[PDB]
Paper text:
While chemical methylation of an amide bond uses a strong base to generate the imidate, OphA, the precursor protein of the fungal peptide macrocycle omphalotin A, self-hypermethylates amides at pH 7 using S-adenosyl methionine (SAM) as cofactor. Omphalotin A derives from the C terminus of the OphA protein, and it is the OphA protein that methylates its own C terminus using S-adenosyl methionine (SAM). The structure of OphA reveals a complex catenane-like arrangement in which the peptide substrate is clamped with its amide nitrogen aligned for nucleophilic attack on the methyl group of SAM. Here, we report the structure of the peptide amide methyltransferase OphA including complexes with cofactor [SAM and S-adenosyl homocysteine (SAH)], cofactor analog, substrate, and product.
Y76F, R72A, R72K, and Y98A were unmethylated even after 3 days of overexpression in E. coli. Arg72 hydrogen-bonds to Tyr76 and makes a polar contact with the carbonyl at residue i+1 (the C-terminal residue, Gly411). The Tyr76-Arg72 couple is reminiscent of the Lys-Tyr couple found in short-chain dehydrogenases/reductases (SDR) enzymes, where the positive charge stabilizes the tyrosinate anion. In addition, complexes R72A-SAH and Y76F-SAH show similar active conformation of the substrate peptide. We predict that removal of the methyl group of SAM by changing to SAH would remove the “driving force” for the flipped conformation. The structures of R72A and Y76F with SAH do show the active conformation. A different conformation of Tyr98 is seen in inactive mutant complexes (Y76F-SAM, Y76F-SAH, and R72A-SAH).
Residue numbers in the entry:
A (entry chain A), B (entry chain A): 8 to 387, 399 to 409
The structure:
Amino acid sequence: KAGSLTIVGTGIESIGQMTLQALSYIEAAAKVFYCVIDPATEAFILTKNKNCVDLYQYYDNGKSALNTYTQMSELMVREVRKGLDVVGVFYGHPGVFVNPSHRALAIAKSEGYRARMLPGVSAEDCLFADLCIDPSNPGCLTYEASDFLIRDRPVSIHSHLVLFQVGCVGIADFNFTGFDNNKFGVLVDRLEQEYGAEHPVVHYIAAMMPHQDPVTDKYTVAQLREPEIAKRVGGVSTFYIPPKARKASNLDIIRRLELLPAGQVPDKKARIYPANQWEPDVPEVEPYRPSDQAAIAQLADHAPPEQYQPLATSKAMSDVMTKLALDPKALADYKADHRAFAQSVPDLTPQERAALELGDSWAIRCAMKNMPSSLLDAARPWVIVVGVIGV
Amino acid sequence: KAGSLTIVGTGIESIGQMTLQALSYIEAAAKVFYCVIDPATEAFILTKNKNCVDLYQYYDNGKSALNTYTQMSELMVREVRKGLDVVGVFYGHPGVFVNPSHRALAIAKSEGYRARMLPGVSAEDCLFADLCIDPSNPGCLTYEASDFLIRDRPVSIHSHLVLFQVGCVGIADFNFTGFDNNKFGVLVDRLEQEYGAEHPVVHYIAAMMPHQDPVTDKYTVAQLREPEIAKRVGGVSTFYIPPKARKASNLDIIRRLELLPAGQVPDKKARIYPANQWEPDVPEVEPYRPSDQAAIAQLADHAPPEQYQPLATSKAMSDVMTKLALDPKALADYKADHRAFAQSVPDLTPQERAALELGDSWAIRCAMKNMPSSLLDAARPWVIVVGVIGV
Ligand SMILES: Nc1ncnc2c1ncn2[C@@H]1O[C@H](CSCC[C@H](N)C(=O)O)[C@@H](O)[C@H]1O
Ligand SMILES: Nc1ncnc2c1ncn2[C@@H]1O[C@H](CSCC[C@H](N)C(=O)O)[C@@H](O)[C@H]1O
Ligand SMILES: [Mg+2]
Ligand SMILES: [Mg+2]
Ligand SMILES: [Mg+2]
Ligand SMILES: [Mg+2]
Ligand SMILES: [Mg+2]
Ligand SMILES: [Mg+2]
Ligand SMILES: [Mg+2]
Ligand SMILES: [Mg+2]
């Protein structure tokens, strides 16, 4: 069935936070529809495709957001129904606090068209990077501020809390000059109830232009009642609220997971460097403990272990794998007929050609890496473990 | 002080999910250190810089993950201390479940070097895109599975739940052949306690190669006890657990936010299209209600409103804004001296040159967009509202 809809993001910071694949789909599309919030990103998009439409022109003062979203979605799906490869482009991650992307994709999918959303860099992704926090330690609760209030969503004082749309509390209408955030005090009351007047709240605004610095301003909950401080919270503001305390381990789980030395399970307040610098009353953690120093001393005698798999590929294979990631038309051709595609790629070795003919992950990997004899294959599979994971 | 550390991500899907800015830093760096999980991405990186080191060679069987992380961080910071511009590259978002990035950046920052993490596309970002869910509706709780168990982290049956590292429950050591996930039953017990035996759990694995499809398999909690099903959960598996019910609105908040018609506040089970297709017993929602049809009918008579700001820029300005986003060396030069940089860009109009000299967001925007008279400036500022936001 002719026609496709691919929805992509621009990320938050102008131009640079777009993914390579998002760019390649924008370039390949027959028609591009976009909704972005800075003109440099807009201009950039217009250099990449000749047939773009700005969706922002469908907003209006007093016009219901839902009617705007229905219209934005319909403009995209109308072109899909004509048999065109259509790309929608939205700020950030195009499925994070975005209504028309989900609507348009769901319609396209239900009518039998190819439909896909590509992920992008969200404001929360930026927040993690700029506030130097890992959502994994100690978990992350993420809400829209009005939804948080209206449905009385639970906080955990032991985990990260992230609140979107803190500059738009309770606001229903659209307006081109933004909104008077007159119900912000309702949010502050809730934060006082949950955390206390002296608990920190970090006002976060990611840099939107490449040369700008992020806003990373720590206030007390009580400071948010001051008019001069409240005034700073706008339409691109997010709040990060750090944990008030650390949660203890559960003895039953320690025992069932066989973390057998129970005295040597760390104290709940013990930290792996670095500690969260936004949490109240967190002790300084030593970066170079004797164990760290001993690990560093081992670097002089280091050799890769026997099971390590060196890259052993070719220019031809690297080129084709790159083309498959960066050329949506090549990818579609490959997906339509693995064998015909694989047989038309010049300079591939027999193993490379065979691996591509199959399309199997393991086969492609074994073609591109020297899998050693030492690594006796349990595949007849890997694990990441690059964080403070398990125990 | 000479030297810098920039940590960047590759995203999840091979090559294509790297951001433009991540690529530009990889190309500009004096030394690149990387930890990625597929060889196509590895090969790609090696074509972009002549001085790369694979951090994965510092893992070993039985060697503590913490010693590995200390070593990985130290390898990067050692080069920073020599005055080099160093880039670390990690799978996904480089601050999401990654220890050595945070460690290395914190050390570099405390010793007075330039230090920054650039966000990337995480597994959660992929999950939102592939499962067609918006974390904003009805909020999203995100945990590491072992941490979830050991610290008895709270679930909300009314919000999204995302669990990372479900294939590695309680696992401490590294091993090149992955892990036997023998304590998976401890996770399933907790999920049964919180949600019930018949509640859905979505096993999610994002495509890692461009031609692959994601795994999006719905099981009951009870089905996860079957050995053939449990076996499928591995090191790149994430669980998504949808809400069991919808949460009602709070009358006090409705009243304080002046959502004045109380009878016309939607029923808690009323949905904006599309509904979450993973939730149990969710009714079909009509995409084309009479209100949707009326909105679509208005498209024929549409003209952009008076307050809409058309792009009105130049090739010279678009080129420089693109260069600032995509050339870290140009950006540093610009940041060091706005005026000297701005005065050396040829073909800029006087307004464009002046806007760049200042560096102010508003000034750059007003140089690139026709700000109409109708939009009488409250700036002497915008809001997004592209989702089901406020009310
Ligand atoms: N520059 C910025 N810094 C911090 N938060 C931002 C931001 N831009 C947008 N946001 C957050 O996102 C909300 C807009 S809703 C759109 C979000 C976008 N799709 C994304 O992926 O993030 C804002 O109210 C704010 O909470
Ligand atoms: N292809 C994939 N699909 C779904 N989840 C994945 C994935 N690859 C990694 N993950 C999740 O991430 C964990 C690895 S920890 C590293 C996460 C990475 N920095 C990121 O940004 O996502 C896994 O246990 C799994 O829960
Ligand atoms: Mg989504
Ligand atoms: Mg908190
Ligand atoms: Mg590839
Ligand atoms: Mg592509
Ligand atoms: Mg981070
Ligand atoms: Mg849930
Ligand atoms: Mg720019
Ligand atoms: Mg750049």
